[PDB]
Each structure stands twice: as structure tokens, then as C-alpha cells.
Subunit: 260 residues, 6 copies
Amino acid sequence: SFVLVDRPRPEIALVTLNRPERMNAMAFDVMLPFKQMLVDISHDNDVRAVVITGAGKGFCSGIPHIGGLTQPTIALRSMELLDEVILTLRRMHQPVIAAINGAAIGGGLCLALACDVRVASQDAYFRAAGINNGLTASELGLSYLLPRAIGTSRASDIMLTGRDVDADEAERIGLVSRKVASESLLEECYAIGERIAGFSRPGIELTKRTIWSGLDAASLESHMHQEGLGQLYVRLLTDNFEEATAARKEKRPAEFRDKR
Amino acid sequence: FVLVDRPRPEIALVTLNRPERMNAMAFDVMLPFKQMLVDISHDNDVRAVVITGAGKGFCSGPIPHIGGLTQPTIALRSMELLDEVILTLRRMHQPVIAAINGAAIGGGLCLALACDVRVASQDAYFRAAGINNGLTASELGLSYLLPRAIGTSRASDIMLTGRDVDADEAERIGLVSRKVASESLLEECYAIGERIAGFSRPGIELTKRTIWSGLDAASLESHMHQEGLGQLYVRLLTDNFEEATAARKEKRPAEFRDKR
Amino acid sequence: SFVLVDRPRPEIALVTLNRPERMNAMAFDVMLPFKQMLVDISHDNDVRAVVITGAGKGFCSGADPIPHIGGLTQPTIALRSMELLDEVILTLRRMHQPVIAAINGAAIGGGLCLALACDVRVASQDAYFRAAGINNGLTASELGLSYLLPRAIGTSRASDIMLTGRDVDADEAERIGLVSRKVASESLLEECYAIGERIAGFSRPGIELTKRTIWSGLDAASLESHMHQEGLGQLYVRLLTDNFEEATAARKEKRPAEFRDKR
Amino acid sequence: MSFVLVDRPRPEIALVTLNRPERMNAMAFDVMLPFKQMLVDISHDNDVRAVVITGAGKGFCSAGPIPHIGGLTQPTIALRSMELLDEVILTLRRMHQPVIAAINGAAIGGGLCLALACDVRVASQDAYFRAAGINNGLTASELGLSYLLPRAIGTSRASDIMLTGRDVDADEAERIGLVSRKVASESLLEECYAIGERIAGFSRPGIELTKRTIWSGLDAASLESHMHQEGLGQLYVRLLTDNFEEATAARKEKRPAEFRDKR
Amino acid sequence: SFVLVDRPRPEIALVTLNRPERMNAMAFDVMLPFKQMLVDISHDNDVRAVVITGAGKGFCSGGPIPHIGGLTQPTIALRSMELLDEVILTLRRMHQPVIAAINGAAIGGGLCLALACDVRVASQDAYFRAAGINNGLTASELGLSYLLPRAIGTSRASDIMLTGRDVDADEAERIGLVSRKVASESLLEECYAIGERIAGFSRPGIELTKRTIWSGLDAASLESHMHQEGLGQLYVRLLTDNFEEATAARKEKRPAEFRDKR
Amino acid sequence: SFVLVDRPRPEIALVTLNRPERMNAMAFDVMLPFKQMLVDISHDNDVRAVVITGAGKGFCSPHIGGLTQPTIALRSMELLDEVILTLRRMHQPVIAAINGAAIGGGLCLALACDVRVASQDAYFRAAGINNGLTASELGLSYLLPRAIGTSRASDIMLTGRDVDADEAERIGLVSRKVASESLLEECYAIGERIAGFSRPGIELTKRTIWSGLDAASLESHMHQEGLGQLYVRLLTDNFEEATAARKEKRPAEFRDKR
Ligand SMILES: [Cl-]
Ligand SMILES: [Cl-]
Ligand SMILES: [Cl-]
């Protein structure tokens, strides 16, 4: 009921947050089947790319094993649960593309930023709603990931005012990389997914990982070691590069076998 | 030297006041300043701080505690006095908003980056003036913070060439998050501070703290622990969340008490 | 013959990647010597700024007899070949002088990485960028790209670019800050010489240390620690030159400053 | 018979026994897979305050079906196998309760890495350690070894051990701080339980946050950012429980503290 | 007066925590005259080295908070934690090296205080505990979980923090929580000998050594960090004739007399 | 001839600092090619492990046309910085055979080696402070706390005291302490152990260790370690050979290939 999965294209999974009346709020009865679904899809090798979207007008508007626990540990467990949604998205083998169909506020914004790629429809808007909710603006990666997406100036402004950021702004400042018509939003994300599906699987998987490890790295030279090894790993253990050369000489798109 | 006003009951306005010399860095304009910042930080009537310069510029004399010292150490002390200004702004409880009314060059550009939010007048401009002055372009956090605000390609060009950056370009590239008409600059800044003041006190404090801490962090996962803890702190120790829900339901302004 | 070195302006070296027929893809047997040329220019004190551009229509496509390979098995030889490219990137960074990428055409794969290794990036109207590793069936990330691209253009744009293997045209490159400037093809070298001459007009140690603090600031964990390095450099040039007194005099009189970099 | 046993030797202490002694408790996927699910399950088990891990038989820890590989090729399959082991290290790290490694014998290769992923390390006199990835013809580094060994014992000692693939006996391990405690073989479990009992009598959130700050302290770049996390955690427990007043009343009354983690 | 300041040698300040009937606890009454006094000392150019110690039996264990008009409970708690954080950070920031003369119990905040100092010397009577954990809280506070593993390694720090055990002076010296242990009646004398050595060296030389050590803990990259160290070395070498003076003092059979100038 | 190179065992290069009269001091003119000697060894595939020592009692104590003194001084610091970074970057492990005084830059040089071994007569000092400068250069303030911990590093650097061989071993500044007559023998045995192991195996080990110092995320660094581990595992038959060698009670002879 609360989370839907579809296969709109043969290698592309679409995950729908489905509690439209609550704008797909990050309640636990949503976020728990959400997390498990992500784990299942990471393990499913027919899937090369994943799109996330909200049912209805919003994208996302942001407990078990609690026997014997007091309220303060329980709250710790509840936040940990949401933290794990964020880290699970980042750890998935496949790139995750956020199809931001509407409001993406508070934790919904953090959810977008936990994806690899972000696409806005004309109707998407964003807010750091933690601050409007009388708490902090910062939760679930937001104070880490927002400035790395759009820079300090724009991130501070957004986090300290709790103002609305519309689709035009979002694309202008690089909060999303694309902005499209509402009724083409998913189609655009599928088109992204399909380009990804035609690339090397380990090639793609290591690319996603080096980007995230790249945020968590503070030496160029150290990080370059990880990047190089993955390039050589795929080069030596597949015939992909010979195949891309052979395809481009025979004026043809490449078909990658990911093995010798 | 430095004037302070209360143009709204929870907004302190700090006016750098040596207009004849473009409100320049001065080891007698600078250290008074530091203690004024400290006092404003301890001043619980103040929720937001606005800094601007008198006259047309924004920001471009005995080093105290000097007896017994020699030239090399004296010079370390004087640079340290400036480094502490940068660091004191970052440490203040309240967000600091730069109302950039005119030239911000050298240390003046550094000051503005030490502020949380940057708002440009159409008449504002920026320069990495250390380089035009026969020195390096880098000081006072500039080579750390500028690239994190506007990205490397743009940061390097501005710092290596020592060119002037006008208001249009500053706003376009994310050096400031807003550009407005000269006559509306302070009022735009008052409206921002008033929003901040309408939000949770510890909410805001911890938000500002997580943003700065976020630049000084190199692990997504470590940083999330700090954000989450602050979020739960305010959630559990206040009734703020319920008050935001009640005010939203009753179409009225939130009045956060920051207590249960 | 694989790269040309010219001196178009008195204190500016132009390095022209010269395999036009292969869009300036560089050979593994050119790599050790190419790094020696950069090294030599670093130690050429006539040179205050370096411009790198492509011969023919392309800028650089990166990948194409690896030296010091005797007795090695294939897997090690491959690590050695990746290291040679790594070290080219690091050498640019390490050069005393700022390096300006005059991007005249396609900068793809290793060529995008090369531009990112340079301090300043200027695009011709004809320039394009692509993370071609992914199009070539490998990963998109090599040679610092996964580290340096988000630091240029932020994560949203970088992840899109790297994962979809699309082309970024000159317009989009300036807009998103992959390059700082975009000019007509016939003005590209001229724009870069003008930037180079500004730089030559500044203090040599002032410039050298600016460049080093920039790269050092990316490899830095703490605002406070990094300030220590910056401040030390600023005091170093201030106390060991009268450059600062010269800049004040030069503005009083309305003449260009002429820094002596000594007292 | 199952490759991983769990017991409850003391009311709030889980004992995890790696239980394929015929292979010195090697990290074949038959052992590790049910290892990881049991760890997760224990983390969700609120009866348990501390976890102890040991090896059955002579060894502490020294291949089988890789799951979810349908439609996958060799190189990707190898990626999955390595991730599976990585996830083990990260799960131990991420568990609510402190883990105590009761090292009763050989901890070599992945087994040394396993010990390093625990919070506390106690050696039997019979314990010994080896970075056996190197002796196996590979690198010495995997599963965090090259990150964590030097954080445990310093670079000098780590490099020596990793590059030479020598045995480090119990006397050395305790002396250099690879383990914090060394005890007779017959007292090993007893020593670990006493540790686990001290832990159980401390605050639950207090302990959980301590473990988390220690681990995130090592993934931290700034003393000052780290203190923010630490202080938040301290204020959290202080303001939301009466533990601190309990601690005061307990010392004034000369009794064990009895923390209720609540007001 | 909850803090005493003495001048036991002409270039050495001694700071005594002076509430022995409470084992010198980190009450705000103590911690206020602390930070401002340390800042004062930092600006006193007669002082080349600082020693900190506790009156009576203990070193330091774990009163209106100022500036809290109109704050609520949780914000006042933030303010009080910040006060303590800023003491840690001030010690780090002082020009002169701070030597902890640890004469007794150094538990919780008092252990954290010792880690905030550059050099730690234990009396034979000294002992350490991460007492936040014994107090029903976390063991981690005031830099502890950052600085303990960097002093002694993870294995040892984890054990100590999770068990709330007492760490005697023999252990503290063995595991490098302190670099020295001496007889209790010789404690201050040992730290004074350390301070006089410090005093005999370059002032910039010593100031930049301390700063690079602290910054190096907050550094991500060796190569980055080397740029800071090299600049400081070149700065002192080129702005003083100290290096020539150390060469000449050796030859001429006379002590080095560094005047920090040419 | 301020640098000697020998080959005391078949895959082992000995680099002997050879200016004993000056206790093997940093000479500016005789290190701009000493970096090149290391670069030549690094690219010599006959050599598996490098041992560095000093002649005599001690271990260890251009292009400026048109430059001014401040910049010449930056150039001069750079060349010494380049020596530190070069050791770190060599393909092969570098073993410091510390036979005597290792003071100042001589201590930093030792810290830039992978493995440190002290003679009983070896001693150490952060001599920049005794020289009226700072104690910190060439990595010292970064690498010394990561070898011996903060407490001990700060004491050593701020006091400029002597650290004898006994203390060096006890605190982990060196990992081994031997009799003077046995120093080079101990380092050769270690070198030949290294030579017996996989070449890419060894090279990636060194790199991960150095890189691991310049990492601030466990999870990040684990990606690098695993990739390198898988790379050698699938691209060679070493693992299968180790297995076979044990079972046949013979030494392993790794081919670094399938
Ligand atoms: Cl639309
Ligand atoms: Cl054109
Ligand atoms: Cl001997």
C-alpha cells in the first residue's frame, strides 16, 4: 500500500512514495517498507537504475524493537532509522534518480540530496522545513550535502530563512541538474536511466561510489588511488574498452559484456 | 569607529564606521570590533546580526600587548588579531548577515565570507586585493571559503587575476545569495533577520553551528550524528514541533517558546 | 614533436598538445618526457604563467611503450601506466606558475581531467566536455575527476554529467562554472595571454603561494588550520619585500605597480 | 553445527561464537552471512548490553556461494564478495552495543580485521596476529586494516607488521596496544564478561553514544566539529534522564549506581 | 579565589586550580576566572611557558551561568557546555605551551583538561578516569573521544572510555597518556625544568611548533600540512639570526641566546 | 660521492648517505640529485626493497637565475619537501637503518621511510628547536604524533631533548632495536621477506598505508583497500600459489600473473 514499485522500462525500477494525503511524509510505516524495498532492488540484478517519486502533488514532506527502552533511546532509534534510509540510498549498487514531482521539504529535501541525480518538474519546490517546524534546519545530511550541491552562500540563506525554493531557482543554482515539464518528468528520468543501463555495470557502480567517497575524502592524491584502481579493474577484467573502440570504428553503439 | 544599533527589537546592526578610509582593516578598528561581537553574542535580546559599512564602501595604530616582542612575533600577533575576527563571527550564537553596500576588497571580502548570509547592493563589488597589493590573494580563510562558495574554477580566476567582481556577477555565481537596490539593502537584511528571529533560538544556533561544522567535516556519517542529535535535542526539550503544527492548522504565525 | 613549446608573450609559456590527428590523445611513451617539460617550465624563471591548448580541432582526449617496464607482468605494467597519468595531473598542481587551460575543442576523458588539473579554465565557443571513461565501458572516474568536478560545479551537476556520459557544450560549461570564462574561438589565446599578463604583473612568491593555498585548501579539513598556512604566506611576502609599499605608491601616482619581491 | 553460535552467559551479554573450527573459523560466506544477520538481530535485542565475540576451538578467526549473482559476471561478482565482507566490519561498527573481541587464538588476515572492527580487544596468552593477506600473495590491506591498525598502534609498528607478514604474539600485541588487556587462556571469557558487566551497569544511551563518538572521532577532521557531537550527546543524556543525580546519590550512599535512563 | 596565578620562575606562569575541598571541580565559579586568566597569560610577554596544577589532593574533577537572562532550560544547557568547550579551545590557542602538572585525580572534565594541554606530566599519585560514563552520561566530552585515541591508540582509549576504570600513573606513562611520571614531591620541579628549556628556545619558534602540532591533528593531508610547517621554519630562519646564533654558541662554548631578530 | 648505492642482496638496494664528516648533513646541492637517485631506484625493477643508512657515526643530521632571496628560500624548502614526498612515492618499501644520530631533517627523513630500525647506538632529536627555529618541518608535526601519539610527540618537539634507542623502540618511533653489528643484517632479512611477497601486493600495501594517513573516512579508505585486494586476487594466481606452497611445505614463488 504505502510504497509502490514498478518496472516502466526493462532495467529501470520506479519507486513511488504512496501516502498522497500526507504529501508522502516520512512516517515509519512509510520509511520502513521504503528501506526494505531499496535493499531488495539493490540485490536485484535486472535493475540498472532506480527512480524515486511521490504519488499525488508532493514528492516528500518529511518504531519496532522498542520493548524495555525508555523514551530518549527510543527517539535515538527513530532518528537512526531515518539516517539509515539516507545511507541505504547512497550505498545502493545502482544510481538513484530523484523525480521531484512536487514539494520536497524537510526530510523530503534530504531524501532528494541522498540520491545521485535530481530532476525537477516545473512544480517542484524545496524548503529546509526543520527550521519552520521549530527545530533545526539540519538533519539527515542536509548541512553536509546542501552546500556541496549549491555552495555555502545559497545553502546558508536557504537553511536559515526556511523560504521556498521553486523549480527555476533549483535548476539555476544547481540543486537539481534538470528541470522539465510535469508530464514529461518520469520520461526524462527513464531516459537518464536508459543511458546508464547501456554503460558498464561495474563501471556505473564504481562511478557512483567514487563520487560519494569523493565527498568523504580530503586528499586528492589518496582519492585518485581509488579511482585509478577501479578504472584498471574494469579495463583488465572486461573487454569493454576494446568493444567501445570496435563499435565506434564500425559506426555503431557499444554493447558491454563486462567480462573477458 | 564601530557603531551598533537596534533597528528592529531583535536585530543588531553593526556599522563599520571609518568611511574616509573605506572602513579599512585597522589594528584599532579591528580589536574593538572583536569584543563588540562577543558582547552581541552574549546579548539575548538579539536574534540576528547585520553588518554593513558607513559611506560608499563596505570594508577594505598600535598592536597591543607588544612590549618585549620583536618584529616577526609582532607580525604574527597582528595577523592573529585579524584571524580572530573571522573566527569570532563564525562562533557567535546568532547568524550574521553581510549587507554589502559597496567595495569589499581584501580583508573586506574575507569578512563577508566569514558571515553566514551575504546580500549585495547593486553597488557592491569584490576583490581579492592581497594580490593587487603585492602579497598573496590568500588570507583570513579566503582560499578555504571562496571555493566552497562559488566553486574552484571561479574562485581561482578571481584570486589569481585580482579582478573586480560586480554585484551582478556575485549574485550569478553564488558569492552573495541575493542582490537588491541600494536603497533596499538594509531592509532586505532586516526582513531576513526577522524570519530568523521568528524561528527557534536553539534551532537557529545549532543550524548555524552545523553549517560551519559541515565545512570542517570530512565524513557524511560523522556529520549526520551531530545534526540528528541537535534535531532530537530541540524536539524533545521543547514543544516547538507541536506549536508549528498548531499554528499551521490555525493559519497564524508560529510563536516558539523553546521549552515544554 | 608531440608537444610544442612557444613563448607568445615575454613571461608566458604556451604548451600546445600536438597530436591533432588523434585529437591530442597522448601516448604512454610521451608521458615521462611531457612531465619533464612541465617540470622544466616550472624551473624556468622567465615564465610567470603557462597556457595549455590543443593543436587542430580538439583540446585533449587523454588516453591512447610504457617506460621502465622490464621484468614486469601485465597487472603491474597497468598500475605503472595509470601512475604516469596520475603524476602528470599532480605535476601541473605542483608547478610554481598558474596553469591556464585554453580549451579550444573537445576535452574528453583524460582531457577533461587535464583541464581540471589546471588552475584556470577558459573555454572557446567550440569547446565540449565529457567524462568519456563511462562511454568507453570503464568508469567515469580517474585522474581526480570524481574529486575535482563536484568541487568545480557541485554534486548535482557532477553526478549527472559523470553518470549519463553526456557532452557539456561551451555555454553550459561557463554557466555551471566548469570554466570561469567563455570567448569566441579566435579570441581564446588572447584572453588567456591577458590573464597570464595580469599574473606576471603580480608578485612571484605572492602568486606561487596563492596557487598552493588554493590546492592546499581543497586538501584541507579545517578552516582554522588552513588559515595558519595562508597567514604565514601573507606575512612572509609582506615582511620580506616592500611590495605592499610599492602598491600604495603605484596607486597614489596612478601607474602600474612594479613588484621587486625583495626589500 | 550452525557456523555461528549465540549464547547468553550473563543476563545482558551476548556471546557470539564463530563455529567452524575445522577451518580455524575462516570467513567463508557460509560463516559471514549468518554472522551479519545475527549481529543486526543482537543490535535490535534490548536485553543485550554488550556483545563478546570469540572463535570455537584453537582459532579466533583466519569460500562458498556468493548470494544474488544471477545474471552477473566475474568482476562484478568479485565486487559483491568484497562488499559482503566490508558490510561485516561496518555492521560491527554500527551495532548499538560495544563489541568485545575475546581473541583465543590465531587472528590472521580478515580475522585481524575482524578484531579491529570491534570496540575492545582482549587477548588470550595464546592469541597471535598476522596480516596474512600479504603471505597469501595479495596486499596486506583490506576491511579497514591499513586505516585502523595505525590508529591502534602507530605507523612504525603497523607498517612493519603489514609489510613483513610476521607473527605478532600476545605479549607484543598487549605491549604495543593492538589489544588493551592480556589474560591466561582459561580466564579469557571471564575477563570479557567483567568488561561487559561494567558496560551493562552504565547508561544505555550513554554507552551507545560513547561508541559512536569514538568511531566518528576517527572519521573526523576537526577537533572543534567533533566536540559539537560530543557535547550534544552529553547534554542529551543529562537533560533527559536523572542519571547524573543517581550517580551522585549512589556515591554519597556508597552503593552501585542504578541508572534508569529516564526521569 | 578559585584560581591562583604564580611566577615560580621569571618566564614561567603557574596556574593553580584552588578549590581542594571539591577536588578542584569544574564549577562555573572556577571556570570563569580560568579562561580570562589564561587569555591574560597568553598576552603576557614575560611568560614563555605555562604549568597548570591542582591545590591539595586532586588535579581536577568533572554558581550562576552568566548571560542567561530570558533563556530557557535547553539553551542554558547549551551555554554551559559551550563555556567548558571554550576553556579547552583557549588552552590550545594560547601562545605558550601549557604543561599539565597532574598531581592527583584527573577525572572526566579534569582528564579533558589535561588533554587540552600540550605536555602532560604525572605525579606517582596521579590517576585518570573518563568519569562522564560513571556519572550516567557518555564518556565523550570536551574533545575526549577525539584526543584520547590520538594520545594512546584506539584499543586503549576504547577500553578506558567504555569501562570507566581508573588509570594509574604507571599505566598512564606506559601507554603515553602522559609522557613523564615523577615522584610527587618532584612534580612541579619537573614541569619547571621542561618550561625553562622551552624558555631558552625561540619564542616564534616555540609558538609555531605548538600551533603546527594542534593544526596537524586537524590536518587531512601530509602535503598540505608540510606547507604550513615549511613557511613557519622559513619565516623564523629569515627574520631572526637564531640559526647562526645556535651555530656560534656551540663553537664559542657559551649558551645559545636567541634574540628573535637580525 | 655524497650518495652511495650498493646491492648487498639480489633484490635489495642500499642507499648510504656518504658525508660522515658532517654527520651526513642535508646539503642543498647534494640532494637535488639524491632525489633523482631514489627516482632511479623506484623505476628499477630488479629492486624489491630499499634500505637507507648513514656512513660513519651518524645516520643523518639550483635554478635560481633572476630570483630574489625570499623565493630562493621557498625553492630551497621545496627541494627538501620533494625528498620527503619522493620516499613516500617510491614503488618499494624503504627501510631506515638508523645507525646513529637522526636529528632534525634527519629524523623527518626516517619518518618518511616505511619501516624504521634502530641501532642500539641510535638516537633522535627534533633539532629545529635547538637550532633557534621551530621543531616542525618536512612532515615532523604530522608524522610524529601518528607514530608515537600526541603526548610523547609534543614533549619531544618542545623540549628538543635526546631520544635514545631504548626509548625509540619502547614508544614506537622505531619498530625494532638491534645491536650495531646486526643492523644491516636485520634490515636485509626484512627486505628479503618483502622480496618474497607479490610486487603489486607490496606496492599497494605501502600506498594504502600512506594514503590511509591522508584519509578521514574509514568507509572511503576501505573502497581503495578492497579494489587493490581484488585486483591482485583475480589478476594473478598468487592466492592459489600460497595455498599450494604451504601444502607442499616449500616457499611460495609468486608469479603476479595468471
Ligand atoms: Cl509543466
Ligand atoms: Cl566563435
Ligand atoms: Cl650494540
